[PDB]
Structure 1
Amino acid sequence: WTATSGSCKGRCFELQEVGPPDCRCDNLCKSYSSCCHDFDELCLKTARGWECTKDRCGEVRNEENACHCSEDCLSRGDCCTNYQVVCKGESHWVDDDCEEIKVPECPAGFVRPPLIIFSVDGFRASYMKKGSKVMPNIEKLRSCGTHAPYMRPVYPTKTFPNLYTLATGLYPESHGIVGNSMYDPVFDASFHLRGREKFNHRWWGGQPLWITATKQGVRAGTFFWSVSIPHERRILTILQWLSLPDNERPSVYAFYSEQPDFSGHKYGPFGPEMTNPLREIDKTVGQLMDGLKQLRLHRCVNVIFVGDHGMEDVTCDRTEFLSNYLTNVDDITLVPGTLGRIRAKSINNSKYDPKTIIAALTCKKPDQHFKPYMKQHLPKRLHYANNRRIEDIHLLVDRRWHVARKPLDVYKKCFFQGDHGFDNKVNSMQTVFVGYGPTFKYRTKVPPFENIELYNVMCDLLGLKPAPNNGTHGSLNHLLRTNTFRPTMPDEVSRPNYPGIMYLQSEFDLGCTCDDNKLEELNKRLHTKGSTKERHLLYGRPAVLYRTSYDILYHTDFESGYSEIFLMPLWTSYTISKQAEVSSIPEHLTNCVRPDVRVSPGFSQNCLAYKNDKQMSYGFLFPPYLSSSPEAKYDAFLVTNMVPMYPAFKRVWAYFQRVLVKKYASERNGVNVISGPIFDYNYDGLRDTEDEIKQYVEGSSIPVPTHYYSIITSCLDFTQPADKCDGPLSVSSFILPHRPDNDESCNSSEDESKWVEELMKMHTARVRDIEHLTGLDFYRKTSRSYSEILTLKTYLHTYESE
């Protein structure tokens, strides 16, 4: 109940919200049906429109007007945005040359430059170039400020997940808004776009920017606008808030536009009807900037122009129907559209089986436009699993397609021509970023980056300490003129042991077998003391950031950090020059495994466990194919270089090591490779402790990895070889799921040259994703600045075209 018989007199767009049943006068009251009776009349004036005209100049203040052209309007802070232009001979902000803003030029009483976040729904990244003729204000922001060619949204590329990621720095799995539609089994409640439940605070985790600001004594403008409040009135409200006295004036403001997304759904991303919505967004930007100039704030405010996701062409006829795959289509609930989430219709139904649902949806049709996954098997780069709100069964839908349960669902819900929600690597889902202001750089282009990074930067801009989040603070320092955040490398927690030769061959009973001079004896010894280490370990050894017991092991061709707890390397490092040659495993060595005389039998794997385990085989981290000499090849068969691998996965791994590593070394002028195992049994994206491991090689304590990673580094200037690089680095990485079958690749019964690289590209990763998953910190010793290394660690190689 609201006693809607209070009044909004002097309260229009009040900054603190009042508690029911007192009536509300804030920018959200409409959405709760709780505005006072007189809100429309007092707070939403429209008389005479939004612009001054010649004849309105110097008028007598008429308080009924939407905005004013009278003499006192400036000191009142309520002129139409074009007042100085029409009535004072001033130019529009867009018609002024840009001039570097070296320092904030702010009115007395401002303690920090304000921040205005201008967010645009469905603003696809290519609109910046393709709509540039009809967006002169936006284009001036872009070319004068700091801009990226595009910004990567989070998955799913829906509106609420992305806006809340912008506000918090968190993946949807951590903030809790994991789609536009959700069921939470603990609350037994549902969350929907339409309606009441979405206003309940228990949906919204982490700490959004407005709460971070408030807690630290920075005042925030209310960020959200009821849909019926027109854009002109939102701008005028922000500009009025900017005229408040110093003790009441917010320091951060948000404007939100429902366009161009609204029209993109109806007409497709490039429908000829899309020109008008883009013109209108630009007109609104122009109104803001003209209004800031009038208040002498246009060289004082930092403005962020940011999208939530792009838009793709999608029509009704590109719909796959689960009823064409499943016989039991009625025993399931599907969350449909550009992603699929499947659960049982009834938890009382004990004959529902996710296993058989997945199998019935797997590679069933020659051009099938979606792929089913258990959520823990989704590419780790999506960070889309660790939430009770995310259903165990997920469908990744091809760009341009929809998935629905039954055909009745589509024609009884062609309406739409655009949609979004797909994999966040898809070009059409990319969105925009432009920063303009004293704290941003002047005329600077920065590389594409992920929207999870912006919360830290907005905190920096406001002098706030960010709540814990998924950004990597410092990775966007290159956007900023000042206010940079100077991070330190994390401290190593465990230092390694460097074992020498301590065991005789005969002490090992591992059931392993192998068919195996003063000039060359001095050689082997030096190699084992780390003589070639500067060749194979180019950026220092990775730091171990948790408490554990491990050994550094040196060899001619590679170096490893061997874990006595997990019985295998945490990491193996080697360099393959452009000239390197691929050999094969000689026949006498096909099944050779050799004890490592530096490592006790008790901390070694054993061959017997593999013989016994009919499901599990083994592979090697440093590949025998890339040995530098027949003598060095024996090192590759050490029991300490061995890892557990399903035969189905060995097909993948063998092709990567035999063909692809050499291919990248040719193409990139040498590569440094670091590979290792990952254990993430609870799919939280974080290194498992040993008591979290759910699977072991049968009869033994050898833990089975959930994934294998590799980080492949070279010189960005590929005229210099990877091992002699004078400047910036270039990286690509991956985190391959370690699976007992290749069901994920529909073409797997073909030659590895037809499917393996495609699989690896799907599982592309950031070095930072590998760091969370292993508790290691890479690139500890380079000649580059730490900020630059942080940027490199957040890089994702996406394999999309331009």
Structure 2
Amino acid sequence: WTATSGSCKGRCFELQEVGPPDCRCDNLCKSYSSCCHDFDELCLKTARGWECTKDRCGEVRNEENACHCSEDCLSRGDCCTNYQVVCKGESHWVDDDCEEIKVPECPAGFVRPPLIIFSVDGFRASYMKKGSKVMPNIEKLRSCGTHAPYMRPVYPTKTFPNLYTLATGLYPESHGIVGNSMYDPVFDASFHLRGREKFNHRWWGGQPLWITATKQGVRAGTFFWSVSIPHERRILTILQWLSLPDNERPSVYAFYSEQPDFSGHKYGPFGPEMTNPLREIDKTVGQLMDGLKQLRLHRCVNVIFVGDHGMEDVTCDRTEFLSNYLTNVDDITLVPGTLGRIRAKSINNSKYDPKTIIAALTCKKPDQHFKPYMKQHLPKRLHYANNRRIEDIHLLVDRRWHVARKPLDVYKKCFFQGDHGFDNKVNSMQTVFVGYGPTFKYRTKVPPFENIELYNVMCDLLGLKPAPNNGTHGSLNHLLRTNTFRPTMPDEVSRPNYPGIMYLQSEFDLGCTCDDKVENKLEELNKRLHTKGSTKERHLLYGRPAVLYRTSYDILYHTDFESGYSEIFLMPLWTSYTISKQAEVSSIPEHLTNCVRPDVRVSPGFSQNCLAYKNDKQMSYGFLFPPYLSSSPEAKYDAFLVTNMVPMYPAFKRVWAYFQRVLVKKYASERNGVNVISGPIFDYNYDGLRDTEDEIKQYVEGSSIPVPTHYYSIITSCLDFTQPADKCDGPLSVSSFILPHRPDNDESCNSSEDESKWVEELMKMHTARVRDIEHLTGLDFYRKTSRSYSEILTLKTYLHTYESEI
């Protein structure tokens, strides 16, 4: 109940919300059915429209008007945005040449440049180029300010998860808004787009920008706008707020547009009906910039123009129906559409079985347009698993497609031509970013980046300390004319040991054998140098990784590779090696097929053993530095050391072998040398973070050899490919992956074919940022380069997407 009998007189769009049952006048009262009786009359004036006509100039103030053309309007801060253009001979902001804004040019009393976030729903990245003729204001912002060719949204590429990620710098799995629709079993409650449950604070984790601001003494405009409040009134409310007295005036503001998402659903991303929504958004940007210029704020405010996701061509006839796969279609609940999430309809049913459901969905049709996953098997780059609201079973739907439960759901719930929510690497899902203002750079293009990074920058822009988030603070310093934050490298926690030869062959009882008993101060002084690290500058190009947690590990040097060997996990944490363009691939000699050799530098007690692999009928083994790429027959023996060995399901050895025997060489050939760092990852609780030893759910049978959940590689070379990887004088280029260590290849529908038809596509699907691998390993890479740390942070957040050009 609300006693809606108070008044909005002089309270229109008040910045503090009053507690029920007093009636409200803020921009969200409509959505709470709690506005005062007179809110529409006083606060939502529409009379005369939104623009000053020539005959309205100098007029007598008529308070019924939506905006004013009278002489006092500038002092009252409530002119129509085009006032000075029509009545005072000024030009529109879009017609002025752009002039670099070296320093904030603000009125007295402004302690900091205000930030305005202009967010647009469904603004696909290519609209910048393709709609450029009809968006002059937006195009001026873009070319005069700082812009990226595109910005990557988070998965699922839906509105709430993306707006709330923009606000928090967190993955949906951490902030809790894991979709536009959700069920929470601890609450036993549901969340929908329509309805009131979404207004309960318990859904919303993290700390969004407006709360960060408030707690640190920076005042915020109120980000959310009721759907009935028209865009023009949103702009005038913002501009009015900017005219408030210093002690009352907020420093951060948000504008939101439901366009062009709304029309894009109806007409598709490039429907002819789409030109108009784009003109209209541009007109609104015009009104803001005109309004700022009136207030002499146009060289003072930082403006961010940002989308939440793009839009794809999707129709009703491109729907896959679970009813064509499942017999038990009514024992399940499906969250449907551009992604699928499945749970049991009843908790009391014990005949429900996720595993058989997945099996019924796996590679069942030739052209199948979705792929089932257990959530922990999704690509790690999606960071989509560590939340009770994310169902164990997930379907990644092909772009341009939908998944529904039964055909009745589609014709009794074609209507639409456009949708979104797909994998966040998909081109059509990419959105936009432009920063314009004194704090952003002038006429600057920056590389594409992820929307998780913006919370940090908006904190910088406002002099705020960001709450703990998933951005990498400093990775976007290159967007800014002046930086508030200058990151330092994290301190190494554990220093390595440098073991020498301490053990005799006979101390080892590992069940391993090697036909290596084939026998000169020429080649014996040589090999001593290699074991002391004479070739370490070749194979370790950016310094050793730093270990950021407490553990016990050894650096091991070899002719062809260096490793950081964990006495705790009984395998390397990382193995580093350089393969030059000229390097040659050889095969494993017949006599050395099963060869595993004790490492006389490392105790039997801190070693793996071959017997456990023999007894474990499921688990085989592989090598982190590949024997195939040994530099000489003699160096090859090094590759067979028990300390280069890691556990591998036979199904996974098919992937690994192909990567090591074929792809490393291909990359070295195409990129002019590559440095490779490979290693194991353990993430049994799927939180994206390194497991401690006590979190490991699986060992090689009868041993303390823990089984990785994933294998990673980071493949670095010179951005200038004319320079060799081992002699690069400038910026680097990187691609990485985190491959799931799975006992089958069910994920790849063509895996019965040759590795050359499916392996590389699998690797591409599991592309990763170096930063993802840091979180998962507790390591810090690129410690010693000639590059600035900010540039390295940018490099670490890079993702190689394998999509074609936008």
TM-score range, shorter chain: over 0.9
Map Cα deviations across residues 137-182 of structure 1 (whole Å, 9 max, x no partner).
0000000000000000000000000000000000000000000000
SS of residue in 2 equivalent to 1:631: helix
CA deviations on 1:658-708 (whole Å, 9 max, x unpaired) are: 000000000000000000000000000000000000000000000000000
- Measured against aligned partners, the alpha-carbon deviations of 1:13-56 in whole angstroms (never above 9, x if no partner) come to 00000100000000000001100000000000000000000000
CA contact (8 A) 1:381 1:763 kept: yes
- 1-side partners of 2:97 and 2:194: how far apart? 45
Distance, in Å, in 1 between the alignment partners of 2:137 and 2:18 is 37
Displacement of 1:8 after TM fit? 0.2
Cα pair 2:380 2:768 within 8 Å, conserved: yes
2-side partners of 1:127 and 1:425: how far apart?
Answer: 17
Q: Residue deviations 1:342-394, cap 9 Å, x none?
A: 00000000000000000000000000000000000000000000000000000
Alignment check: 8 A CA contact 1:573 1:674 kept: yes
Once the two structures are TM-superposed, the CA of residue 400 in structure 1 deviates from its matched residue by: 0.1
How many angstroms does 1:648 deviate by? 0.1
SS in 1 for 2:460: helix
1:263 positional shift: 0.1
Structure 2 distance, partners of 1:485, 1:429, is 31
- For each residue in 1:390-430, what CA deviation from the matched residue of structure 2 results, as whole angstroms up to 9, or x when unmatched? 00000000000000000000000110000000000000000
Aligned-residue offset at 1:483? 2.8
Structure 1 distance, partners of 2:49, 2:653, is 70
**Matched-pair contact (CA < 8 Å) for 1:474–1:484:** no
Q: Partner of 1:259: helix, strand, or coil?
A: strand
Which residue matches 2:683? 680
The ranges of structure 1 where at least 4 consecutive aligned residues each deviate by more than 3 angstroms after the TM superposition are none
Q: Distance in 2 between matches of 1:677 and 1:767?
A: 14
Tell me what 2:384 maps to: 384
- CA distance in 1 between counterparts of 2:504 and 2:358 reads 51
The answer (yes or no) to whether the contact 1:301–1:438 under 8 Å persists in 2 is: yes
Q: Deviations over 1:597-619 (max 9, x none)?
A: 00000000000000000000000
Cα deviation digits, residues 305-348 of structure 1 (max 9, x gap):
00000000000000000000000000000000000000000000
Q: Give the conservation status (yes or no) of the 8 Å contact 1:477–1:484.
A: no
Q: Would you say the 8 A contact 1:735–1:765 is kept in 2?
A: yes
CA distance in 2, matches of 1:53, 1:590: 87
Q: Does 1:78 align with 2:78?
A: yes
Given that 1:766 and 1:795 are in contact with CA atoms closer than 8 Å, whether structure 2 keeps it comes out as yes
| Deviation, structure 1 residue 461 | 0.1
SS at 1:330's partner residue?
coil
Q: 1:270-297 CA deviation, whole Å, 9 max, x = no partner?
A: 0000000000000000000000000000
Alpha-carbon displacement from aligned partner over 1:415-470 (angstroms, at most 9, x marks no partner): 00000000000000000000000000000000000000000000000000000000
Distance 2:574 2:709 in 1: 15
Conserved? CA contact 2:340–2:397, under 8 Å: yes
CA contact (8 A) 2:184 2:190 kept: yes
Q: Summarize deviations over 1:468-500 as a string: whole Å, max 9, x none.
A: 000000000000000341000000000000000
How far off its partner does 1:59 sit?
A: 0.2
Q: Residues of 2 paired with 1:146 and 1:277: CA distance?
A: 24
Tell me if structure 1 keeps the 8 A contact 2:512–2:596.
yes
Maintained 8 Å contact 2:159/2:308: yes
* 2:445 paired residue number: 445
Aligned partners of 1:61, 1:531: CA distance in 2, in Å?
85
Matched, 1:617 2:604: no
**SS, match of residue 562 in structure 1:** strand
**Contact kept? 1:168, 1:469, Cα under 8 Å:** yes
How far, CA to CA, are the matches of 1:147 and 1:137 in structure 2?
14
SS in 2 for 1:640: coil
Secondary structure of the equivalent of 1:465? coil
Q: Distance in 2 between matches of 1:5 and 1:195?
A: 25
Q: Secondary structure in 2 aligned to 1:634?
A: helix
Question: Which secondary structure does the structure 1 equivalent of 2:643 belong to?
Answer: helix
**Cα distance in 1, alignment partners of residues 484 and 394 from structure 2:** 40
CA contact (8 A) 1:312 1:418 kept: yes
Confirm or deny: 8 A CA contact 1:560 1:572 kept in the other structure. yes
CA shift in 2, pair 1:264/1:172, >3 Å: same
Gaps of 5+ in 2: none
SS in 1 for 2:633: coil
Provide the secondary structure at the position in 2 that maps to 1:471. Answer: coil
* Matching of residues 193-272 of structure 1 within 5 Å: 193-272=193-272
SS at match of 1:639: coil
Q: Distance in 2 between matches of 1:16 and 1:635?
A: 70
Q: How many Å apart are 1:773 and its aligned residue?
A: 0.0
**How far apart, in 2, do the equivalents of 1:224 and 1:137 lie?**
24
**Residue deviations 1:90-149, cap 9 Å, x none?**
000000000000000000000000000000000000000000000000000000000000
Give me the whole-angstrom Cα distance separating, in 1, the residues matched to 2:96 and 2:528: 71
CA contact under 8 A between 2:372 and 2:393: conserved in structure 1? yes
Paired-residue identity, %: 100
In 2, the alpha carbon distance for the partners of 1:360 and 1:195 equals 35
Q: Report the Cα distance in structure 1 between the residues aligned to 2:677 and 2:482, rounded to whole angstroms.
A: 35
Deviations 1:234-269 (A, max 9, x none): 000000000000000000000000000000000000
Matched position secondary structure for 1:664 = helix
Contact 1:475–1:790 (CA under 8 A) maintained in structure 2:
yes
Q: Tell whether the 8 Å contact from 2:580 to 2:674 is kept in structure 1 after alignment.
A: yes
SS at match of 2:678: strand
Distance 1:63 1:340 in 2: 52
SS at match of 1:708: strand
Instruction: Assess if the C-alpha contact under 8 Å between 2:533 and 2:558 holds in 1.
Output: yes
Where does residue 335 of structure 1 map in the other structure?
A: 335
The question of whether the paired residues in 1 share the 8 Å contact of 2:676 and 2:715 is answered with yes
User: Aligned with 1:610: secondary structure?
Assistant: helix
Q: Distance in 2 between matches of 1:413 and 1:622?
A: 56
Q: Is the 8 A contact 1:766 1:796 kept in 2?
A: yes
Secondary structure of the structure 2 residue equivalent to 1:769: helix
Determine the C-alpha separation between the residues in 1 that align with 2:101 and 2:680.
Answer: 49
The separation in 2 between residues aligned to 1:154 and 1:408, in whole angstroms, is 31
* CA drift at 1:657: 0.0
Q: Cα deviations across residues 575-629 of structure 1 (Å, max 9, x unaligned)?
A: 0000000000000000000000000000000000000000000000000000000
Contact map agreement 2:166 2:455 (CA 8 A) in 1: yes
Is contact 2:711-2:738 (8 Å) kept? yes
Is this contact kept in 1: 2:658–2:755, CA < 8 A?
Answer: yes
Measured after TM superposition, the shift of residue 639 of structure 1 is 0.1
RMSD, aligned CA: 0.3
Check conservation: 2:372, 2:396, Cα contact below 8 A.
Answer: yes
Aligned to 1:409: 409
Match of 1:558 in 2: 561
Equivalent-residue separation in structure 1 for 2:12 and 2:61 (angstroms): 18
1:710-739 CA-to-partner distances (Å, cap 9, x unmatched) read: 000000000000000000000000000000
Alignment partners' CA distance in 2, 1:33 and 1:572? 62
Q: How many angstroms apart in 2 are the aligned matches of 1:482 and 1:227? A: 37
Q: In the TM superposition, what is the alpha-carbon distance from 1:752 to its structure 2 partner?
A: 0.1
For the 8 Å contact 2:157–2:420, the answer to whether it is kept is yes
Partners of 2:793 and 2:129 in 1: CA distance: 29
- CA distance in 2 between counterparts of 1:619 and 1:250 reads 60
Q: How many angstroms apart in 2 are the aligned matches of 1:394 and 1:24?
A: 42
Are the aligned partners of 1:305 and 1:433 in contact in 2 as well (CA < 8 Å)?
A: yes
SS where residue 733 of structure 2 aligns?
Answer: strand
- Report what 1:103 is aligned to: 103
Q: Does structure 1 conserve the Cα–Cα contact (< 8 Å) formed by 2:146 and 2:435?
A: yes
Residues 101, 299 of structure 2: 8 Å contact kept: yes
Unaligned runs of 5+ in 1: none
Structure 2 residue corresponding to 1:746, chosen from 744, 749, 764: 749
Indicate if the aligned counterparts of 2:463 and 2:484 stay in contact, CA closer than 8 A: no
Contact 1:670 1:714 in 2 (8 A): yes
**Are the equivalent residues in 2 in contact too, given 1:174–1:206 (CA < 8 A)?**
yes
